[PDB]
Symmetry: C4
Subunit: 361 residues, 4 copies
């Protein structure tokens, strides 16, 4: 299943299927006189208590079997080489089975210095996970943070089970955050974070968000494919929901606007360093990527190293061409917002002038 | 003719031909933390004095011959099983001919508990139909309401006759509503209800509306096909009017805005539980369907049962993914309106902020 | 030349080539309760001192040779039969040559009652045409009005000569209008009348306008074809100007807004009774057509009679479906303006609310 | 390299590749009564201390080798014949190597009267070019002005080196402008001038700007091709930046708005006299062209003479059809701005009403 998800994501057509990030509606303003030289560009930024080399992270994907651990090992060793944070996939299977632990632990063996982010699902909190399970997920990889994932859309359309997101999960999460020695990030899984969800999470003490908006890996498409494969009836219902979700660009605006002091990962269809530059200029603190890192990792270590070189060059290209000497300058560089993203923001009450102010701090 | 209409609708290409519901311009905001579990979602709602299981109805289509009665029987027995209200097609032929009565009456034999809605055409009121004919339509199926249909566009382009909609029809309707023991719904037939028509109807005491907007079954197209078939000249005129009408989404807004306390069926191209959810979030109380139910019913009882299962699942998926525990929560869930629907509303003086208040209260 | 124009217009691809009327941006609001019956719809309207049967006119095209006279004869006898006003083409050639007179005069022989509109070009007034030439054009067909045509775009791109539009032409026109016993209409020839041109003309006493906007017969395209045919260099310059001009729908708004008491023909790409209905609802008093009437007339009398039957039926269909009992009701019926037409009006300072008032008063 | 650039630009598909000038969003309002005759249209304008025949210039491209000098010769002799100013390509190579001088000097031999504009790169000013190098570039062709070019986008993606744009380059430019006897123009190279860049340049004494926006020659695409040719990794990064830059139309508005008294060349994808007319009406003083002149020059002298005849005719056609008797009238002619250009301006704080005033006062 963990294998089926990786196989469908890697080898089927589910990246941006019938969906959109709205990042085509964001334009970074070109500066013919940048005021800087390329070699002075500094891409360093903070990630909680650590310093990272590039404002980019690999968000959680996998682990739980030996083949999955070996993808994890490739990603972690390259992320370590580049000074990039790495999230692991859901650790539930390793909480339940001790054999599954090594496919996660290998990450910290091979990547001793970079931030490592643990992973459990929100529904677990209503299915009897609490402090201990969180502490075990964290300890298992000596995590610097834990991501708690929201995936209700995926769960609605998958052949098995049904989503459970009672508010008790948040009361529980809020208690756990009291006893935990590392921060919690709340992340979506391809369908995005709205302002109602961001505000609700914030009222429970959540300050760190990962948008994971639509336009990237389409998890409803992935479950549609799983349903097709088993002749399950839900397949054609999933098809009607292929464009369901908040587009990544809209989600970045919604979280930055509604929680101005959040620490924000902009992810969900980040595929180039230009996407990453746009996500940051729009209001993210860092850009997150999952699928393209998986596909590269599967090809090999050297393929993944080339991938990160390309992303970093493209990010720096966008910084050079906007006169942004550092990540901070990029966060306040000039942009244009047009088209559907503009209409979305307007309808949603995002005053574009107070937005400009909020994103530039 | 009643057969010709069924055959063209079922088997020719007239569903959304050159027309649009504007429902693509409506987005339901995804909630990554729904605040509920799937199993607590409650789809029950009121339909006049009865409780229905799902905020969906089958709107009037057919009856008047044995083969038509057997489609009615299938739809009625499945609607009964699902707790879904059902309208019958125009009852004129059974007012005139006693042989035609059974093809309507069968509906109540097979569906004893659900709301059943009778049907006569508005032009009949200027052609000498009154209280007695309405009472007979109602009594024939022990109806819980009567739909009075507007189809002037269909009548303009059909080979035979000409439309007649003098206001005397409404004075008469208003008198009838005084003596009748069930409510009157006024419905269109594929071309939509505007705010001028809604307000006029309302000034005569009409409080129940069924939008039946363009973007679904194209009745102008159906008449175009009948015209082509008989070498009638009007065919190419009908072709020019294929996109005539108020789109379903715009018609929902117009009626909810201009008559805030209306009981409102949003129909005309509702083809999925997602369309149904959108129509309800926009301001409808319930969503209506006709064509897709016909096509399923023609395939058989089990085909139609699977159809309703799919609609209901898709509806609940939208409720789940929006954090709507019940139909009432759905009616006030967050939306985005973009594109042509937005421009339509603006031009039509629909202040989007007072609209939000009206559709949510 | 007069024949080459007819031949290119009738048989080449120049109708709406790379151009647009903007009439797709105008929607007539459907009224599902019209409040009228089809048979009470009255299409009569005033045309100066005469009453016409339909708010439609055939605008000027041809005359000057026997074959051209025989097209004129067909158009005139059918327009007479339908109670429709008819303009003739430029009469210059018959002012110059007595042989050319009959191909214009035939129109009045065969159409003794309808309004007939004479035709001369604005540039003629700067090439020494005056009162007498106007009187002779008028007397030659016992005209009820004279159209003075603007065609600078055609003249710029045609193989021969160059346009001349000095204001002296207007001083002269203004003097002529003093001595003339019939009104002057100023018309364009495919490229439309702006507010600056309308206000200038109005300051010289012109109150009757015919928009002749882009989207219909593309005269720049016709001249491009003439250029291609003779290996003239201007062909590829004409190609760059194919979409030059004010779209018909924008031109109707611009003239109605800037001269609220104008008598206005909305023409340029009117191809159905729906186009005609839209043009009138937008602000025109009557709709004009040229090319489709030519093409039909060339096929024959019976073909042209069917053409007008179709136009008239489509017009009345739009009146029915909008609850318009007469032309006046149509002029104030509810519309929606979207898309590029809306952007054009906004940029051009056409306040949509003062526009509504002006088109309806 | 200088030849590789010419060969790719001339013979590969890089003109407007995945980019747009936004000039489709600018409409000149047609005037059916122009108020002028074609033969009185006056295209003369000022270019610093000289008078030019047409408000058009050939912007800098080439020089430095014999084959390049012979293209320069053709352009220069034709520009001289038409009274059109001409810029030369970067003179760096001729500052370094005396053999390279003649391929620039030939321009002044063959074009003794027209304005000739020298050329050096902004990065040279941080690599130790100063007063003397500027004087030598100017003296070598008896230049009437010197252009300093911004090409950071091209430099980012080219196989070799890295862009350097420290502000020291501007302090140095400011000093040089004090000792130079001819004006400095700052120009981009296909990616456009923003308001931040224009204002910064202005604060250092720059008053003359050449937009060189995206939508014309795509220099990122040219470097992409150079990269593909050498199997360089940056090719696929360049591909992601193909649409990077300020569109020419947006750049004209940004410079005119932020520096209302600037002398402004509108260039980047000017391909017809209609484009040139639109650029000028929008806010440019003159329109600039490079690529289409190169392509014509390569075909031959007579081909380039035909090219200029066509541009001039198209320009005058736009002036005739807007009632613009001279260049000054064109600068204040009526326009419509729509679509993405309108959204760009609005987002960028370009108040359209104060814009109207600035572009025509
Ligand atoms: C194969 C694979 C498997 C997983 C995912 C991704 C993929 C591709 N993602 C979601 C991921 O972190 C991310 O939010 C989305 O994929 C959107 O980003 P991309 O469009 O993939 O860059 C994910 N999320 C998480 O929180 N827990 C998990 O275990 C998984 N598993
Ligand atoms: C074959 C058939 C026949 C009928 C219709 C429909 C179809 C498909 N409809 C109109 C129907 O109730 C509905 O308003 C429209 O068809 C729009 O909804 P759908 O797009 O079909 O869901 C209709 N309406 C009604 O009030 N009286 C009737 O007799 C009929 N007849
Ligand atoms: C063959 C032919 C010849 C002429 C024309 C048209 C055609 C098709 N038109 C212009 C005509 O009256 C009308 O304004 C435009 O053609 C736009 O209307 P349509 O799009 O053709 O309906 C025209 N106008 C006019 O004032 N004097 C003329 O002599 C002619 N000649
Ligand atoms: C082959 C060639 C070579 C050069 C260029 C152009 C081309 C086509 N351009 C840029 C040019 O002046 C202009 O700003 C852009 O090309 C945009 O205009 P067009 O879209 O080409 O009209 C250019 N500009 C400059 O300032 N110095 C230079 O040496 C060059 N070299």
């Amino acid at each position: 299943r963990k294998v089926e998800h990786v196989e469908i994501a890697a080898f089927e057509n589910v990246d941006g299927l019938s969906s959109s990030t709205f990042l085509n509606d964001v334009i970074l303003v070109h500066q013919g006189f940048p005021g800087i030289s390329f070699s002075e560009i500094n891409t360093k930024t903070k990630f909680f208590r650590k310093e990272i080399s590039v404002p980019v992270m690999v968000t959680g994907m996998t682990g739980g079997r030996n083949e999955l651990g070996r993808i994890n090992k490739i990603i972690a060793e390259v992320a370590e080489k580049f000074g990039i944070p790495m999230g692991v996939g859901s650790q539930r299977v390793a909480i339940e089975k001790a054999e599954a632990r090594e496919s996660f632990a290998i990450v910290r063996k091979v990547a001793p210095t970079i931030p490592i982010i643990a992973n459990l699902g929100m529904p677990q909190l209503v299915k009897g996970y609490g402090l201990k399970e969180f502490q075990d997920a964290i300890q298992m990889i000596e995590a610097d943070a834990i991501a708690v994932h929201l995936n209700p859309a995926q769960e609605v359309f998958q052949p098995e089970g049904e989503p459970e997101y009672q508010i008790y999960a948040l009361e529980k999460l809020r208690d756990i955050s009291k006893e935990l020695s590392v921060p919690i990030i709340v992340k979506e899984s391809g369908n995005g974070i709205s302002m109602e969800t961001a505000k609700l999470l914030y009222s429970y003490g959540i300050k760190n968000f990962d948008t994971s908006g639509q336009g990237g890996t389409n998890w409803i498409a992935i479950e549609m494919i799983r349903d097709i494969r088993r002749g399950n009836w839900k397949a054609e219902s999933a098809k009607n929901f292929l464009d369901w979700g908040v587009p990544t660009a809209a989600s970045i605006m919604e979280v930055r606007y509604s929680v101005p002091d959040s620490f924000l990962v902009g992810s969900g269809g980040i595929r180039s360093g230009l996407d990453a530059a746009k996500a940051i200029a729009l209001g993210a603190d860092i850009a997150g990527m999952a699928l393209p890192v998986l596909k590269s990792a599967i090809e090999g270590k050297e393929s993944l190293e080339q991938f990160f070189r390309k992303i970093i060059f493209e990010l720096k290209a966008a910084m050079m061409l906007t006169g942004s000497k550092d990540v901070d300058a990029l966060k306040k560089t000039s942009i244009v917002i047009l088209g559907k993203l503009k209409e979305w923001a307007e309808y949603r009450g995002i005053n574009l002038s107070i937005y400009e102010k909020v994103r530039k701090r």
